[PDB]
Design a protein around this nucleic acid. Structure first.
Ligand SMILES: [Mg+2]
Ligand SMILES: [Mg+2]
Ligand SMILES: [Mg+2]
Ligand SMILES: [Mg+2]
Ligand SMILES: [Mg+2]
Lengths: 51, 146, 185, 180, 201
RNA sequence: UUGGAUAAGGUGCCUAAAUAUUCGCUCAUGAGAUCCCAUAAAAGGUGUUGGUUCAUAUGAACUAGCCCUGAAAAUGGAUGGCGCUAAAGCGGA
């Protein structure tokens, strides 16, 4: 019982993110660079896999 | 279109930074062959280097120095950015800025120091004697009070 | 090294501001907020006759400029808080088990219970001076509010953390308690 | 005069030519301004440049004159543009940098420091190609533009560089960096 | 360094530089009471400093740690250790120099009432740019298991009130003296007075 | 042997000599630190510093400085140590 707007909101946090192809960090969906020092801030970002 | 009573406010707004390096800051050189000498900031070369000029009252010629070497004083004299040394001399003499500086605490103390440095043994002894006399008098007054 | 760089923050109408040595203190209708900036070099100066306060930075790379802007933003936020509380509207979403959101202790401390049905209590105390109300209008949501934008936001974040489920597929299990709308009153 | 402050780069006009030969009795003369620490260094630089550009080596040419150029208005601030060729550890580059200074010599002194500091480019690896005063309508570099602003003013945030006499390591009172 | 005993108020000082300054003086031959060592500063971030100290702690002697690097972690003791590092402490002279150094946390039974000097060559205000991370030594020590920090702070606070009280009295005394001088400049001779005026007093 | 004045090297302390002056760069949640020398690379970095070439005060592409990642081994631990960040680091003068 998850009404669509609420579900969308939930997704916004849990799902519509980028992920570092190197260290797996959750990033905002609009990010260019990893932010984590261990990757050496790579540009290699991919979308969080949907379903 | 004039201000009226906001003028007062502007006058009495405590700014954090007074003494900006700008044309006609008085400036006491701290480091170098010239030290304890006064000299005006004529031009500014870059963020760190300035052209100073003790207009010929003071000992220091026109030359570039690091701002690091300077100690800006409360005194200013409005001068044209281009101003050559003769003009500076004319202006400063007219405005009596050096006198003002001397009157001011720092200048006063400097001159006192100079005097102390230049004293004769006898003069030192005279001062000592005077102090002793004062102490005597002072002590007596303290006793009276008590 | 940019010789001078500045920023102008317009104080609103019913605000009693008072900076000193970067220890800014703002008072108004809701709360008295104090928040020091004495870690960046900055001669924030006040104009009480006119409105506005000037943040000004002498020299400094782009870092300094950035810092100045941040400071200005913070000031603005503070002003907003004192005029009108920040209202973080947190909707809780559940799949199966409805979340029991019991506010206690003068609308601080929100006990969350029955999150994914585990019969165990999640305590999440609010920061200094930040009310946690529940909905008048809709059914599920939770208002977090109180002047300091920092603190209310922090509280909200804490609340969210208190919920978020551990070792499962989080794309499938959307259950939790999320910030819907950042607003004012 | 202050000798702690000076940088002893001067500018030298050098003129030289190839020694005349039966086959080429009237050879071309070449000149240049060269920024060098002394006259001999200048000469050497000139020779090097001759070698690089023309077929001309010190042993088969002769210096006609070495003059030494003193700045005409050594207390007027000017905006100097410089064009360099420098060598990095990886390769070779041109760049154009601008320096607000009181003389060409001063600018060059600044430049050498900057290249050393910012690029780790040592004096050997640099070749100044031209310095010229840029009138302030054509200044492209923002750190120079700022200086050229109308009624320039700024506070004194530098810390005191007290004389070594009055630098004493024990202090009565915690000094103040604020000053005023 | 021709005084009998310099008290150094270690607050606001940069650990290493301060230590260096101390060490030379000690060598020369000069008792130095480093006082208020909770407030010394280190130029790294706090976390960085902690990490360094953690690393230091980790180096014990494998065989038998009763011997081997003693990890003295009162701020005063840290300071002392630092000072030692910059002395030839394995000689006799060095040892003597080391002994000459006393260090304290807060300020106690004579060093409240002694003048407290400052080494401005080693002052954090003058030595780090204000956009740099620094760290209070006391906090660092606390992080690495010192414990007596709050207590020390309390003590300091208590002392400050006393100091303030003393200062008021001192100020009053000074004022009185000034008044007396004003009164009793008129009662001397003329020429002498003039002379006095000329040289400042 | 006495005195002088240097060399290489240094000049925060250990350590005799600069907490010298002067211009940059650099913050490192395992900084860096001087021939032989006692290790680091390819590849990255919307880290910051300059540039260069292009387009319409933004967008690109490069480029090389320092820094970061890459960077994991066994007794505890080594720029020689302390420590240093308005350097006591790196490059100059
Ligand atoms: Mg599973
Ligand atoms: Mg001999
Ligand atoms: Mg000698
Ligand atoms: Mg020595
Ligand atoms: Mg050394």
């Amino acid at each position: 019982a998850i009404e669509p707007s609420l579900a969308q909101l939930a997704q916004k946090y849990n799902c519509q993110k980028l992920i570092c192809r190197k260290c797996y960090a959750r990033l905002h969906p609009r990010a260019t660079n990893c932010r984590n020092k261990k990757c050496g801030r790579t540009n290699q970002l991919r979308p969080k896999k949907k379903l | 279109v004039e201000l009226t009573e906001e003028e007062l406010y502007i006058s009495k707004k405590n700014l954090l930074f007074k003494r900006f390096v700008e044309p006609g800051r008085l400036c006491l050189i701290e480091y170098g062959p010239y030290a304890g000498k006064l000299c005006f900031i004529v031009d500014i070369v870059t963020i760190t280097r300035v052209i100073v000029d003790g207009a010929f009252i003071t000992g220091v010629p026109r030359m570039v120095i690091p701002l690091k070497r300077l100690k800006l004083l409360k005194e200013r004299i409005k001068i044209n950015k281009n101003c050559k040394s003769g003009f500076l001399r004319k202006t400063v003499n007219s405005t009596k800025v050096l006198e003002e500086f001397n009157n001011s605490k720092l200048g006063k103390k400097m001159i006192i120091k100079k005097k102390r440095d230049e004293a004769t043994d006898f003069e030192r002894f005279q001062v000592y004697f005077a102090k002793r006399e004062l102490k005597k008098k002072m002590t007596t007054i303290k006793n009276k009070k008590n | 090294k940019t010789i001078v760089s500045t920023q102008k923050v317009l104080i609103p109408e019913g605000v009693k501001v008072a900076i000193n040595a970067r220890k800014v203190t703002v008072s108004g209708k809701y709360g008295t907020l104090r928040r020091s900036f004495r870690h960046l070099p900055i001669d924030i100066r006040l104009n009480k006759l006119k409105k506005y306060i000037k943040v000004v930075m002498w020299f400094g790379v782009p870092d300094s400029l950035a810092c100045i802007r941040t400071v200005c933003t913070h000031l603005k936020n503070m002003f907003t808080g004192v005029t009108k509380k920040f209202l973080y509207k947190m909707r809780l979403v559940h799949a199966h088990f409805p979340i029991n959101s019991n506010i206690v202790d003068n609308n601080t401390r929100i006990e969350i219970r029955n999150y994914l049905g585990e019969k165990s209590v999640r305590f999440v105390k609010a920061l200094p001076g930040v009310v946690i109300e529940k909905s008048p209008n809709v059914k599920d949501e939770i208002y977090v509010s109180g002047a300091d934008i920092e603190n209310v936001s922090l509280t909200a974040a804490l609340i969210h953390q208190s919920v978020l489920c551990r070792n499962k597929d989080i794309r499938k299990f959307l259950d939790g308690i999320y910030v819907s709308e950042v607003t004012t009153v | 005069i202050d000798n702690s402050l000076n940088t002893n780069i001067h500018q030298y006009h050098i003129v030289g030519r190839a020694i005349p030969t039966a086959k080429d009795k009237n050879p071309n003369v070449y000149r240049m301004c060269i920024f060098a620490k002394n006259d001999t260094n200048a000469k050497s630089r000139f020779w090097y440049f001759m070698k690089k550009i023309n077929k001309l080596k010190k042993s088969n040419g002769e210096l006609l004159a070495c003059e030494q150029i003193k700045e005409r208005f050594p207390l007027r601030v000017k905006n100097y543009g410089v064009l360099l060729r420098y060598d990095s550890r990886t390769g070779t580059h041109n760049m154009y940098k601008e320096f607000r200074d009181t003389t060409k010599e001063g600018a060059i002194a600044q430049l050498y420091s900057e290249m050393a500091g910012r690029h780790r480019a040592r004096a050997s690896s640099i070749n100044i190609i031209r310095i010229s005063e840029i009138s302030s309508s054509l200044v492209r570099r923002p750190h120079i533009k700022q200086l050229l602003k109308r009624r320039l003013r700024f506070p004194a945030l530098h810390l005191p560089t007290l004389q070594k006499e009055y630098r004493k390591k024990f202090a009565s009172k915690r000094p103040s960096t604020y000053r005023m | 360094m021709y005084k009998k005993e310099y008290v150094i108020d270690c607050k606001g000082h940069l650990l290493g530089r301060l230590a260096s300054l101390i060490a030379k003086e000690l060598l020369n031959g000069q008792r130095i009471v480093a006082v208020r060592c909770e407030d010394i500063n280190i130029s790294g971030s706090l976390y960085r400093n902690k990490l360094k100290y953690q690393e230091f702690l980790r180096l014990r002697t494998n065989t038998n740690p009763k011997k081997g690097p003693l990890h003295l972690r009162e701020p005063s003791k840290i300071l002392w250790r630092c000072v030692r590092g910059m002395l030839p402490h394995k000689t006799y002279k060095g040892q003597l120099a080391l002994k000459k150094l006393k260090v304290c946390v807060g300020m106690p039974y004579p060093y409240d009432k002694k003048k407290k000097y400052v080494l401005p060559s080693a002052l954090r205000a003058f030595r780090l740019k204000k956009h740099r991370r620094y760290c209070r030594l006391g906090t660092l020590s606390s992080r690495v298991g010192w414990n007596y920090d709050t207590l020390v702070k309390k003590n300091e606070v208590l002392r400050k009130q006393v100091s303030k009280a003393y200062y008021k009295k001192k100020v009053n005394n000074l004022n009185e003296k000034k008044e007396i001088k004003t009164e009793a400049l008129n009662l001397i001779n003329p020429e002498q007075r003039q002379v006095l005026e000329n040289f400042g007093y």
